[PDB]
Amino acid sequence: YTRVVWCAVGPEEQKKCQQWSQQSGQNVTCATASTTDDCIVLVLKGEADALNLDGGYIYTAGKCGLVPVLAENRKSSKHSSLDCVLRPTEGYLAVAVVKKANEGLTWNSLKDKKSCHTAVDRTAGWNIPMGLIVNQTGSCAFDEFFSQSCAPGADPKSRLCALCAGDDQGLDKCVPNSKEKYYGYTGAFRCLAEDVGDVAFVKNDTVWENTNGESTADWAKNLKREDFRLLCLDGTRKPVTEAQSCHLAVAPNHAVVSRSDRAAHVEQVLLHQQALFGKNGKNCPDKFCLFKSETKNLLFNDNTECLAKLGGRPTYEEYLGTEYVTAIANLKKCSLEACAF
Ligand SMILES: *[C@@H]1O[C@H](CO)[C@@H](O[C@@H]2O[C@H](CO)[C@@H](O[C@H]3O[C@H](CO)[C@@H](O[C@@H]4O[C@H](CO)[C@@H](O[C@H]5O[C@H](CO)[C@@H](O[C@@H]6O[C@H](CO)[C@@H](O)[C@H](O)[C@@H]6O)[C@H](O)[C@@H]5O)[C@H](O)[C@@H]4O)[C@H](O)[C@@H]3O)[C@H](O)[C@H]2NC(C)=O)[C@H](O)[C@H]1NC(C)=O
Ligand SMILES: *[C@@H]1O[C@H](CO)[C@@H](O[C@@H]2O[C@H](CO)[C@@H](O[C@@H]3O[C@H](CO[C@@H]4O[C@H](CO)[C@@H](O)[C@H](O)[C@@H]4O)[C@@H](O[C@H]4O[C@H](CO)[C@@H](O)[C@H](O)[C@@H]4O)[C@H](O)[C@@H]3O)[C@H](O)[C@H]2NC(C)=O)[C@H](O)[C@H]1NC(C)=O
Ligand SMILES: *[C@@H]1O[C@H](CO)[C@@H](O[C@@H]2O[C@H](CO)[C@@H](O)[C@H](O)[C@H]2NC(C)=O)[C@H](O)[C@H]1NC(C)=O
Ligand SMILES: O[C@@H]1[C@@H](O)[C@@H](O)CO[C@H]1O
Ligand SMILES: [Fe+3]
Ligand SMILES: [Zn+2]
Numbered sequence: 007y008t009r010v011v012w013c014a015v016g017p018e019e020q021k022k023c024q025q026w027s028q029q030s031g032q033n034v035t036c037a038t039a040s041t042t043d044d045c046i047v048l049v050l051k052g053e054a055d056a057l058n059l060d061g062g063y064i065y066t067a068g069k070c071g072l073v074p075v076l077a078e079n080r081k082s083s084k085h086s087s088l089d090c091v092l093r094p095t096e097g098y099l100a101v102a103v104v105k106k107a108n109e110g111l112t113w114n115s116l117k118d119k120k121s122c123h124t125a126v127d128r129t130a131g132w133n134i135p136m137g138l139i140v141n142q143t144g145s146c147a148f149d150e151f152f153s154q155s156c157a158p159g160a161d162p163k164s165r166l167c168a169l170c171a172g173d174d175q176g177l178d179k180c181v182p183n184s185k186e187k188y189y190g191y192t193g194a195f196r197c198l199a200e201d202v203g204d205v206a207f208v209k210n211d212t213v214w215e216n217t218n219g220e221s222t223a224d225w226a227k228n229l230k231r232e233d234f235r236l237l238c239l240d241g242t243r244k245p246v247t248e249a250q251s252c253h254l255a256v257a258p259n260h261a262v263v264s265r266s267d268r269a270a271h272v273e274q275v276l277l278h279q280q281a282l283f284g285k286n287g288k289n290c291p292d293k294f295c296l297f298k299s300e301t302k303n304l305l306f307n308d309n310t311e312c313l314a315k316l317g318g319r320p321t322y323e324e325y326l327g328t329e330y331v332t333a334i335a336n337l338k339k340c341s342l343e344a345c346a347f
């Protein structure tokens with residue numbers, strides 16, 4: 007009843023969900039699916055209540071009647087007078103990142119190069135960069151733009167999956183969950199850091215969080231920001247310190263979605279769950295932290311200060327905004343109004 011079922015994507019999010027479930031005394035329970043779309047279907051059927059989603063999937067879920075409930079808010083210099091839960095969200099910066107040693111690679115010579123995307127259908131990893139490449143290219147042939155990529159969620163036998171590595175045994179190649187070595191903000195950057203790809207479409211925070219000793223993970227231990235460059239749309243290249251003036255787009259924060267008939271209930275539970283296990287919660291550093299998972303962004307991004315109320319009670323188009331929504335529309339013409347499932 008006042009029990010919420012969360013949908014975890016893949017086995018590592020299951021493992022974090024089961025922990026959260028245990029420490030909450032069954033106030034949150036867990037459902038598991040191999041992909042985000044399956045978790046969305048699980049929520050449509052009423053077999054799960056909520057999951058946190060990237061803007062790209064919020065567009066999918068929203069066509070199917072699902073609604074945003076609460077948004078991730080990270081810590082910010084401006085707007086300091088308001089508390090985190092009531093503070094508006096600033097959204098994040100979609101950037102294209104390259105190795106500095108790879109001289110003369112600019113936005114204008116990205117053709118025939120190797121790319122790393124977070125996952126098909128995500129905002130910074132797919133919709134923004136491919137939306138732009140399609141428009142500039144006046145072609146829908148976005149599968150022939152890069153010579154080879156890792157784009158979790160594309161056909162495993164296509165060039166869009168050629169660069170993906172699967173799990174520790176080489177199984178699940180290209181699956182859009184964390185079992186894939188290069189899934190997600192972190193996998194995509196690792197894909198660039200280890201020189202699999204020439205460019206990685208992630209967000210601004212990903213570079214800061216995985217360089218200059220912020221990670222301690224074996225692949226990122228020795229990464230230095232100076233060794234990276236952002237690609238801007240004017241053909242230029244800039245230090246990772248200038249993301250404010252060299253980004254592809256500002257993306258709407260990931261948000262928790264539920265069925266609208268469940269949203270009031272999912273919201274109450276969550277505000278109390280984060281009072282217990284959020285950034286300053288009664289039981290976080292000591293027993294369990296919702297917003298931690300050693301740089302793996304499981305269920306929530308590791309940099310979430312808190313989950314924020316929305317205000318304006320926005321629909322999914324108001325939440326994502328008219329700019330982003332016409333971009334996904336025009337890109338989706340390539341691949342007719344209805345739920346996908
Ligand atoms: C790309 O992503 C990266 C990574 O996410 C992001 O970098 C992070 O940004 C955070 C801030 O936005 C970083 O700061 C946090 O961590 C520092 C650790 O050093 C902490 O130290 C202080 O914290 C206090 C309390 O919040 C700050 O006090 C605030 O109040 C003062 C009042 O005077 C304000 O100061 C003013 O601010 C403006 C605007 O910047 C400035 O121009 C004025 O000159 C004036 O000084 C301001 O409100 C203060 O925040 C204090 O200032 C210190 O920061 C904090 O806890 C702080 O929150 C975080 O460390 C970064 N991550 C990493 C790993 O480096 C980039 O911002 C992002 N870039 C873009 C373009 O998006
Ligand atoms: C790839 O290419 C496609 C195709 O061009 C791009 O899609 C276009 O994006 C345009 C920009 O978002 C979009 O333009 C239209 O802009 C008008 C005006 O925008 C205004 O902003 C004002 C702020 O000062 C605000 O006050 C206004 O209210 C308004 O939002 C929008 O409104 C018009 O449409 C009405 C419909 O009847 C009309 O009556 C009114 O007079 C306005 O003309 C409109 O919503 C729209 O955003 C344009 O529509 C898109 N074009 C097509 C063919 O669909 C993608 O963005 C590119 N992709 C990427 C990733 O960049
Ligand atoms: C599980 O949920 C219950 C219900 O919200 C929580 O216990 C409630 O605590 C509040 C006051 O803190 C009471 O007003 C409710 O009556 C209690 N509910 C009932 C009927 O038991 C409990 O705190 C939650 N447990 C955890 C760890 O999150
Ligand atoms: O992605 C949009 C964009 O307007 C951003 O600046 C804030 O979040 C959303 O509204
Ligand atoms: Fe995202
Ligand atoms: Zn901008």
Ligand SMILES: [Zn+2]
Pocket residue numbers: 318319320321324
């Ligand atoms: Zn509205």
